[PDB]
């Protein structure tokens, strides 16, 4: 029973050269939460079908639990032999089980609030929402970013509100991920979280964030001046970027106040007819990205420490030092596994400071400024690739106030990306796993809009 599972662990240690290949190496076998998880991610999880799928998923979580219980048992047997390195952080493995249980159970259950709120908050014509809190698209998108940061990152309001421009960097192994690397002090603590793009533009945190930044920096052209793009020449090792909040409230310097966000949430969930409990949007979450001790974190992830290993943890199972299953599932994607890119001609007309800094003493900027510019470059690409869809639904959004978007080049891109689908009853982009059947249908998707 125990043996048939824990044997697979030993074979995987042998095959990956974590141990030499000759029985159970009782004394010498390393067992830890991170190796067990890596074993799971290489073998069970990443199993690259209607009623077959439902059964296979149930079976996967049953097997996950049995593998975990088996390796807990193996660890006690190694400890009988005085193995010094068979300690299991069982909380970490309980979060893995809870992560998969939540994913399978919610697929089993199959509108999610993520989609309903996002589509409604992108809508520029929302007469019955609140002219008191949500007069502008900037205010709507500002709210939506906090909402998508909670939905994807499972952070409390207080944690969200500490996100700064300098907190966010592109992944090195996944250049489509934005990584927030949180370091806390009690033996030091590292928690890494990822925002991935979404095929559906309205729930894409990258698209949404970029639209919000677009309005924040440039305002509405005949209407209101923006804050400007940050003065990156003033940045010295993050001095400037670590003080600019990801959302700007009443002053340049502060995230919107919690009491104001409390009202925004109430107002949006009322408008969307969605049940609302403040604690589920404001308080700490039960399921969160894992946090590593400084020692485990530096030692596990340094490939020169482990030159014998065939595959290193960051190659597949923990890209950018985030386990692949958390990264996918917290971004609402399965961990069981651009037709018309935007022309550089158009890219260079929005966020034009990105290119200007690249032209000048680019070399003279701090590394934090260049990491921010590379991030803005990915948000700009995301935003522009999706603008043809946003324009199809919401041509009167504040984004489109710049006379630019009325020009021949922009209109031509907006048309050329979306024309191939104008007569199709089905949306060209995907929605969310388990929801594609229902909501790729245009009529169904449009009906999620409260107004129009």
Number of domains: 2
Q: Give the CATH level 1 class of the largest domain.
A: Mainly Alpha
User: How does CATH name the architecture of the largest domain?
Assistant: Orthogonal Bundle
Q: Spatial order of the strands in the main sheet?
A: 1-2-3-4
The best one-word shape is globular
Question: Radius of gyration, rounded?
Answer: 24 Å
Q: Tell me the CATH superfamily of the largest domain.
A: Centromere DNA-binding protein complex CBF3 subunit, domain 2
Q: What string gives the helices and strands in order? A: HHHHHHHEEEHHHEHHHHHHHH
Task: Kindly state the percentage of residues in helix.
Answer: 40-55%
Summarize the structure.
It is classed as dna binding protein. This protein has 452 residues and is mainly alpha-helical.
């Amino acid at each position: 029973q125990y043996k048939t599972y824990y044997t697979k662990y030993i074979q995987w240690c042998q095959l990956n050269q974590i141990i030499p290949t000759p029985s159970v190496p009782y004394k010498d076998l390393p067992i830890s939460a991170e190796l067990i998880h890596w074993f799971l991610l290489d073998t069970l999880i990443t199993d690259d079908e209607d009623l077959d799928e439902e059964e296979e998923n149930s079976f996967k979580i049953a097997t996950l639990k049995k593998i975990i219980g088996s390796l807990n048992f193996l660890s006690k047997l190694c400890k009988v032999h005085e193995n010094p390195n068979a300690n299991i952080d069982t909380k970490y493995l309980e979060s893995v089980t809870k992560l998969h249980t939540h994913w399978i159970d919610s697929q089993k259950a199959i509108c999610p609030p993520l989609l309903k709120v996002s589509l409604n908050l992108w809508n520029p014509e929302t007469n019955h929402l609140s002219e008191k809190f949500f007069k502008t698209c900037s205010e709507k998108l500002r709210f939506l970013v906090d909402f998508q940061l909670r939905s994807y990152l499972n952070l409390s309001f207080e944690e969200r509100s500490k996100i700064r421009f300098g907190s966010l960097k592109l992944g090195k192994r996944d250049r489509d991920a934005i990584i927030y690397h949180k370091v806390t002090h009690s033996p030091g603590h590292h928690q890494l979280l990822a925002l991935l793009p979404q095929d559906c533009p309205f729930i894409c945190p990258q698209t949404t964030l970029a639209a919000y930044l677009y309005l924040r920096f440039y305002g509405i052209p005949s209407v209101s001046k923006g804050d400007g793009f940050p003065n990156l020449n003033a940045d010295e090792n993050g001095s400037l970027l670590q003080d600019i909040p990801i959302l700007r409230g009443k002053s340049l310097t502060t995230y919107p106040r919690e009491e104001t966000f409390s009202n925004y949430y109430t107002t949006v969930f009322r408008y969307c007819h969605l049940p609302y409990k403040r604690r589920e949007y404001f308080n700490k979450c039960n399921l969160v990205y894992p946090t590593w001790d400084e020692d485990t974190f530096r030692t596990f992830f340094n490939e020169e420490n482990h030159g014998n290993w065939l595959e290193q943890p960051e190659a597949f199972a923990f890209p950018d030092k985030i386990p692949f299953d958390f990264k996918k599932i917290m971004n609402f994607k399965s961990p069981y596994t651009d037709p018309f890119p935007p022309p550089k001609d158009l890219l260079v007309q929005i966020f034009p400071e990105i290119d200007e800094y690249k032209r000048h003493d680019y070399e003279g900027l701090s590394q934090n400024s260049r990491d921010f510019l590379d991030l803005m470059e990915v948000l700009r690409e995301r935003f522009l690739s999706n603008l043809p869809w946003i324009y199809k639904f919401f041509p009167n959004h504040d984004i489109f106030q710049d006379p630019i978007f009325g020009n021949s080049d922009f209109q031509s891109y907006f048309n050329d990306k979306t024309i191939h689908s104008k007569g199709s009853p089905i949306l060209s982009f995907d929605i969310l796993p388990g929801f594609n059947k229902i909501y790729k249908n245009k009529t169904n998707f449009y009906s999620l809009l409260i107004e129009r």
